[PDB]
């Protein structure tokens, strides 16, 4: 029953043999352009050493399964002779490589380690689960503080600078310019890209639990990018890195003078009242918590159409988090959250990943090396240690008033005392979720869609809560389920459903366009504006790098 | 006559939009300071466009009902919804202000109400103005108790870091004064220092409020040893001091002190109200038995000599109260000071609210107004013999124009004086009439120059060059009218003190004299001992 | 000229210092019987009129004595200031925002330019096609952004039923235009014919509806009669085609039908007000058109306008070009936006609110009525945009109902055939439908006709119950040939006219019949149409 392991690995072999002819091309022909005056990428070499021992240990396990029907110390002897020529043949094959980019990939693959060991976050971690195994009552907050604070400590002495990424440089540098800032965020309208553009304005809302440059990385994968090329005016939210001076900062201040301020500055810059939205994760709330705010006070509605990536509103399957939602726990997070001013996204990190795609190596480590690409990995990777802090009055809201006592859907929800209701909002709904999902479990995605009051439509998508919605149509990666039947069960719903391979963001467009008819205008240049793009509240880092 | 008023009130309200502008462009940069781990014009600008609201709009409908139910009560009515509008727009301006920073503007803003009612001062209430032997004493001390009472009720900064902060030392402490010497600013000074006798009425430290508006500061800095006289607030253990004592114990002593600390037996002389006065008396003692003189200028601030014209403290000097407040102060050991500052005010500056509180918050600093309502309630004692030697020596027998005044039975005679003489008064001083003070000029003997403010008793002498606010009259010929030497003055404009400098500079310069250690840090310990603590 | 204000201000001033001796002695008998708005606020209030009005006489009796009365006039209100946060010092903090608010909305209602009607710079303006349709868009626009942010703004509103509207009742029958609610008794015998009151459906109906001390509901109801009220939906879009014909057949006819089935009497004692009145009246001209047995016994018509030609300060909209536009946007929108109508008039304009209904109400020991009042002319209804436009120009514009030729459901009114005798209630001092205008509507109908004249305003002269005993009215049996005739004839009375319009209903008779206990509902009363707002209260 190893077929299909055999297959795989023989496919990545004979492209990694193809690189390496043309490395040698490469070599050859930079010979050629030489003059006698003058004075990166990793080893195929590298690569091939981790292919061998793919091969070899399941070779070894294959054939030691066979004689199974010493036993034990015999196939530990051969597999850790594997293991070390696995040591020898990547420490050779990083001959000739500069000591700095060593380093990197010595930083890299430590990062990648961590990342997939589970008792280092609290979430996953065995230890606190027994605590929570019916164990006890309020030593809980002091056995999740051991353990909380033993996991930073590790973090801490662990925190390589030099070798990283440049946002504007490497990742975030679609051209664009800040036209807006205010205390809570820095808007970026993006330069154009077509000759003409839509007449409505694309609004992004991304989420401020960790940053948004994950839908503007790099050129091939980004979102923001590929929205300009489809003749979109593109604006983003940038959410200042909040400290102590923010700390008062709620979730309704986020929806009002986020959003709200924001959807405002989109018709200080282009004359439109009303804007294509888009939201991801906690934006994705933030997005739908401010159409219910205008349609409850009567406003005149701002939200033409509303995108909503792994958005909960609905918080009954929190998914791993649910570990944290409990009285005790959460209450003690309230008081450290008061004390403190913020919740540190150093000590968030240690509680949980944004980023666990199960194919994370396989998919955007080896395969990305193989297309040609610096690896996605490590861009992925930057991303999700690139953490945020959360101001404390938001982070008790979200920890109080939506993921314990679940105040949006009971209708007890308020934001400046104003009731929501997402009955009373008619904007044109589509939620895409990702069926691997560990935060935004897609189920609990789908319940929340029954809410809102007009027209609703659900896409499912594969992969996980960044690989599955990051996902460009020239990748041809991974494949959506659409279904336009309403359903009485999300189960329902993916039995009548269809799939279709690629992006699912052509469906996206699709649903945004077909609102719109409206002529497409002249395309707009953004403004001068305030300072170039990306803003400067997305290269404040927690642990600063020089 | 509205043109004037409109285009006055246009002024400031441009004026006010420029600092809004400039305060919203200070938020818009403090944005990009974005440190994770600190926090990032007390008065919002809004509280003051509530002011400015109310003050356009009520010369408007002042003006629109001027040229025409009752058409009376119309304008009554219209008027209160103005006031109601200002009311609301006051509390909303003062929203995001804290709780202890709004408690602080409704205390000042109460003194300030309080200040302006004359029926709230004896020298100015309607009921003792309207008075008879036995009955006024009587009365006179059962209003005052009347009005001492309320203030007690309203009445339930700091010397050295917000109002006296030059930097000094004290050199020499008496039972009456303190010494202060105040550190040099400049490489090089005059050789003949600067002494200043401030009244011992009030305390000092107007001649030294703020960097921006301190005498003493702006003399350092013109290249003066400066030496300032510091009264002490006089208990019940100085019952028996005399003017003779701040005289000759007072102010001859001083100089003495200021020898002591530069070899100069020469210094150049400076007076402020009752300190000027007390300046003249020791200098004619000085002059009357024949010794060296030793004040080479003499700069009299508001100096009554002449008291012909006393204005509103008239009402007290009568026959009856003057004995009935003679035989109070020897009897309670010293006259009360929050009994004085219930008698009157010092500070009617015509716009106080305007040119202190309004133009003072638009030109960036702390309200000047609530500094000096809090110098004005920060009342001293005067000594029960030295009061009773000003009612009757003074005010009312007035034996310093004639002969019969003595100090330690020495017979004055200003006329004996040759020393060059300065006299600075304003022509809205409710205490020191400048008629009086400039007829009080001519009983010296030597140089004599009379210089008029343009504004009260503390607002026309408190003017730095850098404030540009206000001017003042000078004559060169001689006039024996007071409207004659008006009539033929010249007005000029901006602050005097260049003038007051050039005086003294015109009668070799010596190493910026560095004071020495001496008793304590200048603020001395006097100037902070208050009755209300 | 000042003797009369000083002697009123004094007067004022008794009654508080009265008022402030009486809480003193009662809380000073209330330390023995024990077991187990301030009026400093009116005071300080009253020092400002006092000091002010004494100013403005020693000023009366060049740049300097100008500035100072400026000067002095803000010395006063500085006091005020004052004085009147330290009265608040002990008052809480929840209450304090709704006197915050109420004052707020006082000072905005009484800017002329604030609405559209008595707004200067449209006068000006109509005094010019297109031109005066845009500037006067310019007025519209700027007013209603300017009260959102002024409007909206706390929970501290009342709430119907519970501090108004709150007779007790059930809610009988509920259509697409109305909610009828029959009251509960009170008494143990009514009167046998029921009657039906028709409020306007401009503004909600509870202004007859306050509290139990000025509920005509509730003194109908005790005056043993058996009481109906039409609660109008606030319109939405939905009910963009409604029609003024359908609020007369399907309105007011259909709630006779509703009485019928709630009672067994086909003969009503009919009720009017305001637009209310205007339907009431056309409701009669068509059943007596279409030749129907009378089904309105009597009817009291208060403030009422069938006669259009005196629009009053409401003839400034009453053009050709401005009556065009609304119409494209009534049919555009589908509806006439009330917290437009916000802006462009104010149905509450009384001469003293503060006086009268603020002063005086807490003098009584009453909340004051000067907040309820303000509170109502907030909640403010749409119009259907086919019913608004019928209004414009059927109407206002075109008089059609004096030259007879209005059409409700192609049936041309007469009010000539209808002799129902009428009683037409109107008050001086209203700007909505000055009275004179009210009179001319008197003579087209075709039966007894009575005319009375109150004292106040649009407002307070109708809603005067019997135990204020505050203002008066004019009553003259003959008939006159114009209003200044029928007043010179006229003789004053003192008090509430309310026992004589009781007379009028009355008078006509017949035998007491049991009290009819109103059946179980679909709701209880006030139902839900009162409470659906324009802009929801938190």
């Given at each position: 029953s190893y077929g299909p392991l055999f297959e795989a690995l023989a496919h990545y072999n004979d492209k990694l043999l193809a690189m390496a002819k043309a490395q040698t091309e490469r070599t050859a022909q930079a010979l050629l352009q030489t003059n006698l005056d003058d004075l990166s990428q990793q080893?195929?070499?590298?690569?091939?050493?981790?292919?061998?021992?793919?091969?070899?240990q399941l070779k070894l396990m294959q054939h030691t399964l066979l004689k199974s029907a010493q036993p034990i110390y015999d196939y530990l002897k051969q597999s850790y002779l594997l293991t070390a020529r696995h040591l020898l043949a990547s420490v050779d094959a990083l001959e000739g490589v500069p000591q700095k980019s060593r380093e990197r990939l010595r930083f890299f693959?430590?990062?990648?380690?961590?990342?997939?060991?589970?008792?280092?976050?609290?979430?996953?971690?065995?230890?606190?689960?027994?605590?929570?195994?019916?164990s006890d009552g309020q030593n809980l907050v002091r056995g999740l503080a051991l353990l909380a604070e033993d996991l930073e400590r590790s973090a801490d002495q662990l925190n390589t600078d030099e070798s990283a990424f440049e946002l504007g440089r490497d990742l975030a540098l679609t051209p664009g310019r800040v036209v807006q800032r205010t205390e809570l965020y820095e808007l970026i309208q993006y330069s154009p890209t077509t000759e003409t553009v839509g007449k409505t304005p694309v609004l992004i809302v991304p989420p401020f639990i960790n940053k948004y440059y994950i839908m503007d990385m790099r050129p091939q994968n980004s979102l923001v990018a590929w929205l300009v090329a489809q003749g979109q005016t593109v604006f983003m939210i940038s959410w200042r890195n909040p400290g102590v001076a923010q700390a008062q900062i709620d979730l309704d201040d986020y929806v009002v003078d986020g959003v709200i301020a924001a959807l405002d500055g989109v018709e200080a810059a282009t004359g439109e009242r009303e804007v294509h939205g888009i939201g991801?994760?906690?934006?994705?709330?933030?997005?739908?918590?401010?159409?219910?705010?205008?349609?409850?006070?009567?406003?005149?509605?701002?939200?033409?159409?509303?995108?909503?990536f792994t958005t909960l509103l609905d918080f009954s399957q929190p998914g791993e988090l649910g570990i944290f939602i409990h009285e005790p726990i959460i209450a003690?997070?309230?008081?450290?959250?008061?004390?403190?001013?913020?919740?540190?996204?150093?000590?968030?990190?240690?509680?949980?990943?944004?980023?666990?795609?199960?194919?994370?190596?396989?998919?955007?480590?080896?395969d990305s090396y193989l297309k040609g690409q610096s690896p996605v990995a490590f861009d992925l990777l930057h991303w999700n240690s690139d953490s945020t802090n959360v101001a404390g009055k938001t982070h008790n809201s979200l920890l109080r008033r939506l993921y314990?006592?679940?105040?949006?859907?009971?209708?007890?929800?308020?934001?400046?005392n104003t009731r929501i209701d997402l009955?009373?909002?008619?904007?044109?709904?589509?939620?895409?979720?990702?069926?691997?999902?560990?935060?935004?479990?897609?189920?609990?995605?789908w319940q929340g869609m029954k809410l809102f009051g007009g027209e609703q439509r659900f896409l499912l998508a594969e992969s996980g809560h960044i690989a599955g919605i990051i996902n460009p149509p020239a990748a041809n990666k991974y494949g959506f389920w659409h279904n336009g039947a309403e359903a009485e069960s999300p189960e329902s719903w993916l039995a009548g459903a269809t799939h279709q391979g690629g992006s699912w963001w052509p469906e996206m467009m699709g649903f945004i366009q077909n609102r719109d008819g409206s002529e497409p205008v002249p395309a707009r240049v953004p403004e001068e504006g305030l300072a170039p793009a990306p803003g400067h509240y997305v290269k404040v880092r927690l642990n600063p790098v020089f």
């Open positions: 080893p195929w070499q590298l690569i091939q050493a981790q292919m061998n021992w793919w091969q070899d693959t430590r990062q990648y380690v961590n990342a997939m060991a589970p008792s280092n976050f609290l979430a996953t971690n065995p230890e606190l689960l027994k605590l929570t195994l019916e991801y994760c906690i934006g994705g709330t933030a997005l739908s918590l401010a159409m219910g705010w205008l349609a409850a006070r009567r406003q005149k509605q701002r939200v033409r159409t509303a995108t909503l003690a997070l309230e008081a450290q959250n008061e004390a403190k001013g913020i919740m540190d996204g150093r000590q968030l990190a240690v509680s949980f990943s944004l980023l666990r795609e199960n194919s994370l190596y396989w998919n955007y480590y080896i314990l006592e679940n105040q949006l859907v009971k209708g007890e929800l308020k934001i400046r009955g009373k909002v008619k904007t044109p709904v589509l939620l895409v979720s990702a069926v691997d999902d560990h935060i935004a479990l897609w189920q609990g995605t």
